[PDB]
RNA sequence: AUUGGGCGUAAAGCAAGCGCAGGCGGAUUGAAAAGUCUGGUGUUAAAGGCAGCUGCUUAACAGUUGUAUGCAUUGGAAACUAUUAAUCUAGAGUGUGGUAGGGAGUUUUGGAAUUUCAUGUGGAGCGGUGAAAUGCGUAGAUAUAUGAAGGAACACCAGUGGCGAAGGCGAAAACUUAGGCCAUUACUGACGCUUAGGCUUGAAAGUGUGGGGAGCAAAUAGGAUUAGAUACCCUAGUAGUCCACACCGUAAACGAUAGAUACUAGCUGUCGGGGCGAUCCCCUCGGUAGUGAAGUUAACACAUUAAGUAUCUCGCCUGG
RNA sequence: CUGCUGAUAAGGUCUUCAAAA
């Protein structure tokens, strides 16, 4: 079994437990990864981190380095493969 | 029911439907539409009776001058169809006529053979029961 | 192709040619006509004896004979044996065959059936070469 | 290869088009029943084949019983094909309205550049090559400036482009003229697809008659290189290349892929019509390209402009 | 930075084997 955070560009056949999600946002990936880790940690019995928690404990920050930009750019680095004679 | 795209059909009524069904099966498409003819309506009725399709539904224009039939394939939960293949026998030009003695058995009885003898289209088993045969349209298994 | 196309011009089957054509021609000698009657083995008369060289790989001197049959065809025939009594003018009895080394040769001579003597000094596979049983 | 094969690169899609006969062909109603299915009857000689049995010591063999196929006639079935009598618009055309084009023919016009000739300045070379030599030049060449004549081809625009069925089409204009795309509450009402035979067009070379000839250049002559050079290089050079009228009818005439029709993921450009109204960009309908999954393939690759799922028609292939 | 630069007699080995340890 393999679970994954599919992000609109993945082949659904390969993944068994598909989780439609984001993969580019460092907040979304963190939230979902920590949710899976929370499942694991609850099963192996420690206190949870994000699951079954209110807003004051689910809240998170946006890493450094208006709104956040989940836009895929840099198409100019996709030239035609070297050809011609 | 309202549509948006133009609807066209081939001149050959059996193989038009067979091509539509085969392409839908291969592409996992569920609902398809085509022009309605009475041979096609009867053949779709027997396919629905034999359980190879979910539903077939005929519709008529507001002026009662055009009729179109739309049908859906029967996919299971894991999305694999009940139809495995289609092959047409009585193509235009070479029409296949077989008496009762030579009525074919498709895939050792797993599939069905469409035969339009004298009472409209008719499955192979019921044709054998009635002891009479005729034109053989297509093999569906 | 197409049912109509084959109805108009049906399938023509490729012809079949024999491997020993000269054995299936019969000359009447009264009306002087040649008819196609199949015959297993035919009598001929030799004209020139000698040796030929095998094609590419083999290297030897193989005994051939230009024999004219009871019909009007002259064929090059390989004498299958070690030593021969052919004297440029004799009657032999050709059968079908094909030696691979010599190009153009497509017949063999049955040994020890007619004027041509058999192959003595042979105890193995002699029934093919016409040798009396040692007893 | 009807059952039972193929034609991009292995043999095989005619160079392309207009197409008579033939083959195939939208939807609904009625009749008849030519195809199709089925019942009765007559017949399909005997021997032979298959099944059963008997007799030869069993067998081979002999004998005996059963055992199909097709044709004709008569009686029914009416789903499909064909025929006939009609209705309908969705295929295909026509009309009106938008509209893009190097589509074609005929007749005129224009400017750069080469060559020749004329007239001035000038004075030893120019040309050509790997290096040179034939060749041109003190009769003033090459160069420079002006002018005239004539012929052929039309820089830039010019394209990750447009048009035609193919060959093919690019300076400007006029006249005549062919097809195509988009939207149609309009009209005819299956009039359509393919096409053996037939007809039309068909790069360049080549032919015949008459014109034209600036440049280039098969054949030809000379100088080089070379063991030789009838070739590659150079200097000259006729036919030809150009126009009109008649033929020839072949090309790697290639997308190495016949035409028509329906269906099957997506993404990126570009060209035209239409919807909105600065451009740009958005949507719809089509043309032309790239990338790309299912699917196909021996592999390369094709992949909504198919080589995929299928049908129809024509042409073609059967080892070297 | 384009000189020149042509030819090489005939036939041939070489995989025995996995049954198996
Ligand atoms: Mg083959
Ligand atoms: Mg070929
Ligand atoms: Mg072609
Ligand atoms: Mg060809
Ligand atoms: Mg046409
Ligand atoms: Mg016709
Ligand atoms: Mg019909
Ligand atoms: Mg009989
Ligand atoms: Mg008997
Ligand atoms: Mg001048
Ligand atoms: Mg010419
Ligand atoms: Mg000379
Ligand atoms: Mg050389
Ligand atoms: Mg010259
Ligand atoms: Mg001449
Ligand atoms: Mg040719
Ligand atoms: Mg061309
Ligand atoms: Mg590709
Ligand atoms: Mg041959
Ligand atoms: Mg040298
Ligand atoms: Mg030599």
UniProtKB/Swiss-Prot annotation, chain A:
Species name: Mycoplasma pneumoniae (strain ATCC 29342 / M129 / Subtype 1)
Domain of life, source organism: Bacteria
Name by which UniProt lists this protein: Small ribosomal subunit protein uS2
Family label: Belongs to the universal ribosomal protein uS2 family.
UniProtKB/Swiss-Prot annotation, chain B:
One protein family per Pfam: Ribosomal_S8
A single MF term (Gene Ontology): structural constituent of ribosome
SUPFAM superfamilies, per database record: Ribosomal protein S8 (SSF56047)
One Gene Ontology biological process: translation
Record has Methyltransferase as a keyword: no
Keyword Metal-binding: no
Keyword field: Ribonucleoprotein, Ribosomal protein, RNA-binding, rRNA-binding
Family under the similarity heading: Belongs to the universal ribosomal protein uS8 family.
Cited HAMAP family: Ribosomal_uS8_B
Subunit structure: Part of the 30S ribosomal subunit. Contacts proteins S5 and S12.
Chain's role: One of the primary rRNA binding proteins, it binds directly to 16S rRNA central domain where it helps coordinate assembly of the platform of the 30S subunit.
Name listed for the protein in its UniProt record: Small ribosomal subunit protein uS8
Source organism of the structure: Mycoplasma pneumoniae (strain ATCC 29342 / M129 / Subtype 1)
From Swiss-Prot, chain C:
GO cellular component, one term: small ribosomal subunit
Cysteines paired by S-S bonds: none
Key word Hydrolase present: no
Keyword annotations of the record: Ribonucleoprotein, Ribosomal protein, RNA-binding, rRNA-binding, tRNA-binding
PROSITE patterns tied to this protein: RIBOSOMAL_S12
Subunit relationships: Part of the 30S ribosomal subunit. Contacts proteins S8 and S17. May interact with IF1 in the 30S initiation complex.
Name used for this protein in its record: Small ribosomal subunit protein uS12
Organism: Mycoplasma pneumoniae (strain ATCC 29342 / M129 / Subtype 1) (Mycoplasmoides pneumoniae)
């Amino acid at each position: 079994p393999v679970v994954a955070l599919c992000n609109t560009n993945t082949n659904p056949e390969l993944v068994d437990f598909i989780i439609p999600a984001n993969n580019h946002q460092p907040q979304s990936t963190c939230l979902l990864m920590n949710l899976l880790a929370d499942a694991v940690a609850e099963a192996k019995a420690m206190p949870t981190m994000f699951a079954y928690k209110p807003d004051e404990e689910i809240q998170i920050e946006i890493p450094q380095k208006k709104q956040i930009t989940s836009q895929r750019l840099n198409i100019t680095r996709n030239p035609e493969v070297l050809t011609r004679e | 029911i309202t549509t948006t795209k133009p609807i066209k059909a081939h001149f050959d009524p059996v193989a038009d439907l067979l091509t539509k069904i085969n392409n839908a099966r291969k592409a996992k498409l569920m609902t398809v539409t085509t022009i309605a003819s009475k041979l096609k309506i009867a053949i779709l009725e027997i396919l629905v009776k034999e359980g190879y399709l979910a539903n077939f539904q005929v519709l008529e224009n507001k002026s009662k001058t055009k009729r179109i039939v739309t049908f859906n394939l029967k996919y299971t939960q894991r999305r694999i169809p009940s139809i495995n293949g289609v092959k047409q026998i009585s193509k235009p030009g070479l029409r296949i006529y077989r008496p009762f003695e030579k009525l074919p058995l498709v895939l050792n009885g797993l599939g069905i053979a469409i035969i339009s003898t004298s009472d409209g289209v008719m499955t192979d088993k019921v044709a054998r029961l009635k002891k009479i045969g005729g034109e053989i349209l297509a093999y569906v298994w | 192709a197409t049912i109509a196309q084959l109805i108009r011009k049906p399938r023509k089957k490729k012809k079949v040619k024999s491997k020993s054509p000269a054995l299936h021609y019969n000359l009447n000698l009264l009306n002087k006509k040649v008819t196609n009657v199949y015959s297993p083995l035919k009598r001929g008369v030799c004209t020139r004896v000698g040796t030929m060289t095998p094609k590419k790989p083999n290297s030897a001197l193989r005994k051939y004979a230009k024999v004219r049959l009871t019909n009007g065809f002259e064929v090059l025939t390989y004498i299958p044996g070690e030593g021969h009594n052919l004297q440029e003018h004799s009657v032999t009895l050709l059968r079908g065959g094909r030696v691979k080394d010599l190009p153009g040769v497509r017949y063999h001579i049955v040994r020890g059936t007619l004027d041509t003597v058999g192959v003595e000094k042979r105890r193995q596979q002699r029934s093919a070469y016409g040798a009396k049983k040692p007893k």
